[PDB]
Design a protein around this ligand. Structure first.
Ligand SMILES: *[C@@H]1O[C@H](CO)[C@@H](O[C@@H]2O[C@H](CO)[C@@H](O[C@@H]3O[C@H](CO[C@H]4O[C@H](CO)[C@@H](O)[C@H](O[C@H]5O[C@H](CO)[C@@H](O)[C@H](O)[C@@H]5O[C@H]5O[C@H](CO)[C@@H](O)[C@H](O)[C@@H]5O)[C@@H]4O)[C@@H](O)[C@H](O[C@H]4O[C@H](CO)[C@@H](O)[C@H](O)[C@@H]4O[C@H]4O[C@H](CO)[C@@H](O)[C@H](O)[C@@H]4O)[C@@H]3O)[C@H](O)[C@H]2NC(C)=O)[C@H](O)[C@H]1NC(C)=O
Ligand SMILES: CCOC(=O)c1cc(-c2cccc(Br)c2)[nH]n1
Ligand SMILES: [Br-]
Ligand SMILES: [Ca+2]
Ligand SMILES: [Cl-]
Ligand SMILES: [K+]
Ligand code: NA
Ligand SMILES: [Zn+2]
Length: 805
């Protein structure tokens, strides 16, 4: 109930919203059906249009007009945006040459540059180039300010998840808006795009920018606009708030456009009907900049032009139907479309089984256009699992396609030519970023970055301390002229032991064998210096990684590689080695096929044993430094040390072996040498964080050898590939992966073929940022380089995507 009977006289677009059943005059009142009787009349004036004309200049103030061309309008702060152009002979902002804004040029009383966030639904990244002729205003922002060629959205590439990620710096799994459509089993409630429940505060986790602003004493202009409020009125409102007294005026503002998403859905991303929406958006930007220029605020305000997601070609005929796969289709609930989410229709049916459903959806048709997953098996880079709102069963749908339950759903709902929501690595999903203003750099291109990073920068722009978030603060320092945030490396928590030879061979009762008892002064000081760390500078190029938690581990040196070996997990946390362009692949000799050797620096009690592997019918083992890349027959022995051994399912060994035998050398050729750091990851509770030992659900049968959920690799070289990895002068180049450690290869439909037809594609699917690996391991890499820390932070957030240009 609202007693809609009060008035909006002198209250139009009030900054503090008021409490029921009193009536409202704020820019959101329409969405709650709660405006005062006179809101339309007083607040949504339209009379006479949105522009001055020659004959309107110097007119009598008629309070009924939408905007004004009378003499007093400037001091009142309510002229039409073109007033000075038409009536005082001024030029439009877009027709002015651009000039570096070295310092805020603000009116007296402004304590900081204001920030205006101009967000646009469905603005595909390629529109910047492809629509550049019809967007002169946006194009001046882009080329004069700072721009990325695209910005990576979060998965799923839907509107609400992405807007709230922009607002909070959080993955959807942490902020709670995990789709446009949701069921919370704890609440027993549903969230929908249409309706009432989406307004309830309990859906919305983390701390959005406007709350962060308020708590720290920065005023925020009510971010959100009712859909029927035309765009011209939104701009005039923002411009009016900017004319308020110093004590009342907001410092941060938000404009949102429903275009071009709304049109893209009907016509496809490049429909010829798409030119007009792009022209209208540019006109809107033009109105804002002209209005800022009028108020002498155009060299004072920081403007962010930002998209939530792109748009892809999708039609009705490109639908897959679960009814073509499942006999039991009526006992399941599907969240449909560009992603699939499956749960039981009734919790009272115990004959439901996720295992049988996954199996029936696995590699069933030659060209199948989705892939099912248990959510914990999704690529770690999606960060899409740790929320009770995300169903155990997920479908990743191919770009250009849809998934529905039964065909009736599609035709008892062809309408659409465009949709979004697919995997966030997909080109057509990429969106935009432009920063323009005194705090941004001038005429600067920056590399692609992820939208999770913006919350930090918008806090920086405003002098705020960000709430705890998933950005890496400092990683976007290169976009900014000043207000940079200068972070420090986290302190190492655990120091390593450096064990020498302390144990005799006979003390080890591991059930391991090796054909190795084959017998010199020149070459004995030699292997000792190797064990003391004489080639460490060759294999540990960026310093040893820091261990950021409390644990007990040893550093182990060898001719070919260096490891940090965990006495708690009985395996290395990390193994580091360098492979030069010139290096040669050999084979594992026959005498050494099943050779595992005791490590006389590590106690039997801190070692794995061979017997456990023999007893465990499911689990085999592999090596972190690959025997294949030994620098000599004599050095090859080090690769068979029990302290280089990790638990591996036979099916994963196929993956691991091909990566190690074929791909490492390939990358050394292509990149002029590589540095490699490999290791295990444990994430049994799929939270994206390093598991403590009490979190491990699986051990190699009858032992305390814990089983990894994933294996990572970080592959580094010189960005200038004319210089070899070990002798690099400048910036670095990185790619990494986090491969799930699976007992089968069900994920790769062509895995009964030769490894050269499926392994590399699998690795690409599971590409990762070094930062992802850090969360999952509690290590901090790149500790000792010649590069600035901000630059290293950027490198750590890089994701190698494997999409073409
Ligand atoms: C991305 O960035 C984010 C932000 O930094 C990272 O997430 C943080 O991770 C922390 C570690 O997991 C976590 O810290 C915990 O805080 C608990 C108190 O939690 C509240 O406080 C914050 C601050 O106000 C608040 O934001 C939280 O809001 C969550 O919950 C509601 C839903 O109930 C949502 O509205 C909201 O969206 C958000 O949900 C998300 O987070 C929770 C995790 O808290 C998930 O479960 C959800 O799925 C969802 O993703 C909270 O209201 C505190 O209780 C924890 O302490 C427990 O564990 C420690 C170990 O140190 C132990 O000392 C204690 O004993 C304690 O355990 C007790 O409870 C257990 C369970 O009942 C029980 O097993 C024990 O026996 C004990 O009795 C913990 O310190 C922090 O909350 C989140 N913050 C957010 C916003 O998510 C995230 O890690 C980053 N991601 C990556 C990949 O890096
Ligand atoms: C759903 C309609 O959305 C709106 O009206 C709107 C959204 C934002 C916004 C979005 C993301 C980050 C920030 Br910070 C602000 N501002 N206005
Ligand atoms: Br939002
Ligand atoms: Ca974990
Ligand atoms: Cl959804
Ligand atoms: K075995
Ligand atoms: Na297979
Ligand atoms: Zn949309």
């Amino acid at each position: 109930w609202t007693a809609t009977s009060g008035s909006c006289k002198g209250r139009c677009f009030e900054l503090q919203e008021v409490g029921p059943p009193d009536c409202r005059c704020d820019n959101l009142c329409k969405s709650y059906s709660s405006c005062c009787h006179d809101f339309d009349e007083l607040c949504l004036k339209t009379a006479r249009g949105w522009e001055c004309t020659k004959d309107r200049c110097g007119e009598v103030r008629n309070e009924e007009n939408a905007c004004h061309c009378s003499e007093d309008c400037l001091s009142r702060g309510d002229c039409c945006t073109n007033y000075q152009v038409v009536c005082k002979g001024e030029s439009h902002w877009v027709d002015d040459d651009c000039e570096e804004i070295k310092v805020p040029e603000c009116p007296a009383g402004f304590v900081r540059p204001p920030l205006i966030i101009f967000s646009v639904d469905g603005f595909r990244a390629s529109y910047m180039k492809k629509g550049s002729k019809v967007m002169p205003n946006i194009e001046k922002l882009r080329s004069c300010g700072t721009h990325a060629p695209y910005m990576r959205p979060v998965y799923p590439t839907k509107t609400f998840p992405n807007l709230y990620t922009l607002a909070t710096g959080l993955y959807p799994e942490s902020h709670g808006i995990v789709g446009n459509s949701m069921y919370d089993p704890v609440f027993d409630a549903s969230f929908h795009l249409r309706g009432r429940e989406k307004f309830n505060h309990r859906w919305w986790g983390g701390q959005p920018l406007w709350i962060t602003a308020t708590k720290q004493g920065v005023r925020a202009g009510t971010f959100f606009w009712s859909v029927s409020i035309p765009h011209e009125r939104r701009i005039l409102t923002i411009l009016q708030w900017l004319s308020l007294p110093d004590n009342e005026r907001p410092s941060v503002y938000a404009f949102y456009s429903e275009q071009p998403d709304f049109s893209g859905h009907k016509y496809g991303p490049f429909g010829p009907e798409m030119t007009n929406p792009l022209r209208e958006i540019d006109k809107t930007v033009g109105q804002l900049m002209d209005g800022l220029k009028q108020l002498r605020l155009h060299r004072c305000v920081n403007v962010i032009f930002v998209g939530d997601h792109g748009m892809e070609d999708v039609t009705c005929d490109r639908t897959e139907f679960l009814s073509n796969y499942l006999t039991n289709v009526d006992d399941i609930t599907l969240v449909p479309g560009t992603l699939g989410r499956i749960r039981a229709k009734s919790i009272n049916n115990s004959k439901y089984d996720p295992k049988t459903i996954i199996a029936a959806l696995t590699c069933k048709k030659p060209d199948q256009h989705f892939k099912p997953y248990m959510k914990q098996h999704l690529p770690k880079r999606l960060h899409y699992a740790n929320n009770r709102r995300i169903e155990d069963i997920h479908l990743l749908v191919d770009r250009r396609w849809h998934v529905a339950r039964k065909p009736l759903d599609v035709y008892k709902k062809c309408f659409f030519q465009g949709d979004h929501g697919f995997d966030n690595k997909v080109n057509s999903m990429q969106t935009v970023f432009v920063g323009y203003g005194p705090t941004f750099k001038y005429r600067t291109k920056v590399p692609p970055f992820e939208n999770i990073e913006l919350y930090n920068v918008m806090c920086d722009l405003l002098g705020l301390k960000p709430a705890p978030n998933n950005g890496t603060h400092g990683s976007l320092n290169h976009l900014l002229r000043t207000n940079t945030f200068r972070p420090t490396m986290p302190d190492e928590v655990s120091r390593p032991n450096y064990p020498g030879i302390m144990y005799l061979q006979s003390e080890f009762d591991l059930g391991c064998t090796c054909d190795d008892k084959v017998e010199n002064k020149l070459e004995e000081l030699n292997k000792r210096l190797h064990t003391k760390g004489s080639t460490k500078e060759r294999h540990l190029l960026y310093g040893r990684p820091a261990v950021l938690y409390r644990t007990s581990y040893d550093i182990l040196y060898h001719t070919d590689f260096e490891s940090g070996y965990s006495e708690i997990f009985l395996m290395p946390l990390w193994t580091s080695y360098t492979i030069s362009k010139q290096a040669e692949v050999s084979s594992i000799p026959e005498h050494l096929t099943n050779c595992v050797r005791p490590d006389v620096r590590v106690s039997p009690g801190f070692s794995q044993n061979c017997l456990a592997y023999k007893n465990d019918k499911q689990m085999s083992y592999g090596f972190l430094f690959p025997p294949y890349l030994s620098s000599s027959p004599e050095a090859k022995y080090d690769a068979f040390l029990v302290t280089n051994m990790v638990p591996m399912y036979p099916a994963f060994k196929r993956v691991w072996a091909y990566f190690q035998r074929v791909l490492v050398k390939k990358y050394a050729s292509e990149r002029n040498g590589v540095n490699v750091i490999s290791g295990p990851i444990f994430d049994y509770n799929y939270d994206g964080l390093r598991d403590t030992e009490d979190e491990i659900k699986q051990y190699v049968e009858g032992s305390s050898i814990p089983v990894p959920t994933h294996y990572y690799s970080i592959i580094t070289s010189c960005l200038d590939f004319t210089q070899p990895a070990d002798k690099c002068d400048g910036p670095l180049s990185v790619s990494s992966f986090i491969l799930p450690h699976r007992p089968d290869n069900d994920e790769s439909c062509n895995s009964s073929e030769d490894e050269s037809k499926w392994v590399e594609e699998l690795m690409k699917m599971h590409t990762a940022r070094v930062r992802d690996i850090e969360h999952l391991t509690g290590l901090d890499f790149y500790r000792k380089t010649s590069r600035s820390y901000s630059e290293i932070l950027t490198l750590k957030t890089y994701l190698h995507t494997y999409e073409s240009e």
